[PDB]
Amino acid sequence: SGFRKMAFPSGKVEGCMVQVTCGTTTLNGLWLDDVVYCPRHVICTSEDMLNPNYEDLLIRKSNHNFLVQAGNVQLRVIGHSMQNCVLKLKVDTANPKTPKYKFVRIQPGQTFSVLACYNGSPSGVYQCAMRPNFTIKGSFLNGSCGSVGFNIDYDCVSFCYMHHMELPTGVHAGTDLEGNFYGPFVDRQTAQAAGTDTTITVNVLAWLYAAVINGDRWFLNRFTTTLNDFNLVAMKYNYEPLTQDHVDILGPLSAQTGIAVLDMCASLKELLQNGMNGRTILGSALLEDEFTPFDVVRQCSGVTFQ
Amino acid sequence: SGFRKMAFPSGKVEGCMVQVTCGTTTLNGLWLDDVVYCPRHVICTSEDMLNPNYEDLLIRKSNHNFLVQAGNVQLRVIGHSMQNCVLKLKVDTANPKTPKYKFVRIQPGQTFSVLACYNGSPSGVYQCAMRPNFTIKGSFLNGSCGSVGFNIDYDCVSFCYMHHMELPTGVHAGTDLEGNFYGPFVDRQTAQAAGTDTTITVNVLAWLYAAVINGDRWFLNRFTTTLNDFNLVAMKYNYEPLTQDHVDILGPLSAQTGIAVLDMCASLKELLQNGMNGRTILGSALLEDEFTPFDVVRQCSGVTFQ
Numbered sequence: 327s328g329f330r331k332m333a334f335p336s337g338k339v340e341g342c343m344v345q346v347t348c349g350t351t352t353l354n355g356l357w358l359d360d361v362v363y364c365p366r367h368v369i370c371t372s373e374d375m376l377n378p379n380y381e382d383l384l385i386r387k388s389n390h391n392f393l394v395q396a397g398n399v400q401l402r403v404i405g406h407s408m409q410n411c412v413l414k415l416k417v418d419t420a421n422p423k424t425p426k427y428k429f430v431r432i433q434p435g436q437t438f439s440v441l442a443c444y445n446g447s448p449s450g451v452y453q454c455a456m457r458p459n460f461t462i463k464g465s466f467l468n469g470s471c472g473s474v475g476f477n478i479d480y481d482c483v484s485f486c487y488m489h490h491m492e493l494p495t496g497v498h499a500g501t502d503l504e505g506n507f508y509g510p511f512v513d514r515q516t517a518q519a520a521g522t523d524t525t526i527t528v529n530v531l532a533w534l535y536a537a538v539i540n541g542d543r544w545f546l547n548r549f550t551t552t553l554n555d556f557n558l559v560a561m562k563y564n565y566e567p568l569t570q571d572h573v574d575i576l577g578p579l580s581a582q583t584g585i586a587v588l589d590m591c592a593s594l595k596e597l598l599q600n601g602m603n604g605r606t607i608l609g610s611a612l613l614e615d616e617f618t619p620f621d622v623v624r625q626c627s628g629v630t631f632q
Numbered sequence: 633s634g635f636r637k638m639a640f641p642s643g644k645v646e647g648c649m650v651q652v653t654c655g656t657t658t659l660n661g662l663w664l665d666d667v668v669y670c671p672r673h674v675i676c677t678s679e680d681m682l683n684p685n686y687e688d689l690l691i692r693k694s695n696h697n698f699l700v701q702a703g704n705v706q707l708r709v710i711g712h713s714m715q716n717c718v719l720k721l722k723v724d725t726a727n728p729k730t731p732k733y734k735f736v737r738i739q740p741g742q743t744f745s746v747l748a749c750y751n752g753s754p755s756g757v758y759q760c761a762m763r764p765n766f767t768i769k770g771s772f773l774n775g776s777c778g779s780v781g782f783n784i785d786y787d788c789v790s791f792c793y794m795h796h797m798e799l800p801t802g803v804h805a806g807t808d809l810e811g812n813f814y815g816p817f818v819d820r821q822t823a824q825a826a827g828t829d830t831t832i833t834v835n836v837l838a839w840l841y842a843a844v845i846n847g848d849r850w851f852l853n854r855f856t857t858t859l860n861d862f863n864l865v866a867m868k869y870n871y872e873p874l875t876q877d878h879v880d881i882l883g884p885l886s887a888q889t890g891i892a893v894l895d896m897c898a899s900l901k902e903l904l905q906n907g908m909n910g911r912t913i914l915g916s917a918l919l920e921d922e923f924t925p926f927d928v929v930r931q932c933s934g935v936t937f938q
């Protein structure tokens with residue numbers, strides 16, 4: 327029993343984190359095989375941050391301008407190239423702790439674990455979701471750029487995020503591991519703002535199923551709504567509309583509890599219109615939307631990893 | 633910026649988790665040097681759980697009754713002994729991934745990271761606090777016994793908790809690594825209940841300082857209370873009393889924000905008597921008490937580990 331914000335074990339990722347220094351700028355890099363991945367703005371100075379020309383800045387650099395450290399061992403850079411907003415540093419030594427990995431781009435609403443690092447040293451791990459406005463509500467300080475987000479499928483590490491910058495509203499933006507930004511953001515210190523965020527409805531429903539599994543049932547009722555009558559109320563409260571695919575994803579949770587998806591939607595509709603009236607659900611007084619249906623199944627059924 | 637439930641990187645602990653089987657019972661073990669630590673109830677059957685005599689049960693066992701697996705490698709048990717509620721299995725191979733470690737017993741109110749495991753395989757990591765009633769609000773399923781809690785100081789792993797059982801109210805109880813239970817619990821399936829829980833006041837104050845650092849200031853005021861006038865209100869709402877040592881611990885947070893501790897206590901006193909009125913603090917509609925003053929400093933100043 328119980329329900330926690332659970333992150334993946336970070337051991338397989340800790341061994342891939344390195345320190346990358348170019349000039350007086352130092353951030354984190356991802357060392358896989360003989361390639362080190364890091365944000366390309368590591369080659370920027372104070373004069374370039376507002377209007378950088380990464381083509382010019384990179385052409386004026388050589389391999390010896392990049393200092394890469396794996397703990398105390400120095401990695402000799404034997405080549406460099408730029409793929410979108412990510413810099414790829416070819417090194418002479420292949421990382422012997424390279425796990426089975428792949429590069430995946432996630433969708434809004436999906437969750438992943440973040441290994442926050444500083445000077446190539448892991449500092450902490452936490453779970454977060456990609457928001458519908460393509461930002462994440464992370465916890466990052468100065469020097470955290472290059473920190474990566476990941477999921478673990480069986481024995482394979484799926485890298486999905488590399489941290490690049492913090493927006494003025496305190497939220498964070500980054501790219502996938504191919505260098506392509508999540509959302510309409512660019513890696514230059516211009517006045518960029520994120521669009522309006524919305525609540526991930528399918529995640530709230532999955533979180534309500536986790537509550538029923540753990541004994542919280544006070545919000546239930548015997549009513550039933552349709553998918554269109556629910557979406558009319560949901561859009562009023564800035565909730566993402568619910569689709570038939572979302573219903574099918576919630577299948578296993580509905581079977582384990584014996585509560586149909588449209589039944590639970592009627593309970594969520596009541597919680598949106600009347601509030602929670604000082605009561606709590608799984609120790610929260612707000613509706614949580616950063617647990618996917620898979621996160622609930624994994625935590626309420628117990629699947630490990632190799 | 634930002635504030636998350638952040639756990640320690642679990643890499644150094646993942647390499648110490650093994651699978652321990654005795655009869656038809658399988659749980660997790662901690663492999664440090666040539667010793668494997670696991671809960672002693674692994675030697676119990678169905679007939680013994682309600683009234684076990686661990687002296688008799690252990691004397692009727694031999695070294696070959698214990699099957700220890702580190703992944704696929706089998707560890708030959710060359711000796712066994714019992715220290716309080718923990719079984720110590722001497723094996724022929726010393727764990728080459730043994731980090732610098734120590735065994736520490738934590739106090740109520742302190743936090744630690746939990747590496748939840750099943751069949752010796754890590755499944756997830758999360759942060760939790762030792763409650764004033766010596767339980768933890770964990771997330772554990774069947775087979776999680778032997779999972780350990782830990783903190784990381786510099787390069788040293790401080791083990792502080794080993795999971796033993798879940799109580800009927802859904803909370804969890806365990807021992808330190810010397811086998812001594814936290815709280816008045818025993819490892820037999822009798823009807824045990826935890827005492828009344830209270831809110832960790834010093835942790836709430838530390839969490840309020842984290843909010844001010846991150847831009848949440850709506851709850852502040854210019855009033856100031858005394859330590860005794862605050863404790864009179866706190867005990868009314870089942871809050872732990874505040875001591876002068878708690879004030880000194882909050883020193884660095886008060887200096888960084890320029891808000892005295894007694895000033896913040898006046899704000900907490902108002903939040904307890906009037907509620908939050910539908911407003912949120914750091915994305916929560918409740919007062920969070922599972923962040924220590926050290927957790928806030930570490931996340932709002934960025935200290936890594938070796």
Ligand SMILES: O=C1CC(C(=O)N2CCN(c3ccc(CO)c(Cl)c3)CC2)=NC(=O)N1
Pocket residue numbers: 367370374375376378466467468469470471490491492498512513514515633
């Ligand atoms: O999330 C964070 C990250 C963070 C941090 O280390 N930064 C801020 C972003 N910065 C940067 C430099 C150049 C360019 C373009 O040349 C860009 Cl776009 C960004 C690197 C240093 N500080 C925080 O406070 N929070």
Ligand SMILES: O=C1CC(C(=O)N2CCN(c3ccc(CO)c(Cl)c3)CC2)=NC(=O)N1
Pocket residue numbers: 327673676680681682684772773774775776777796797798804818819820821
């Ligand atoms: O936290 C958890 C742990 C858990 C779990 O694996 N257990 C439950 C406790 N159990 C046990 C066996 C014998 C004795 C004394 O002989 C005792 Cl005290 C406990 C071992 C198996 N299942 C859950 O659902 N939650």
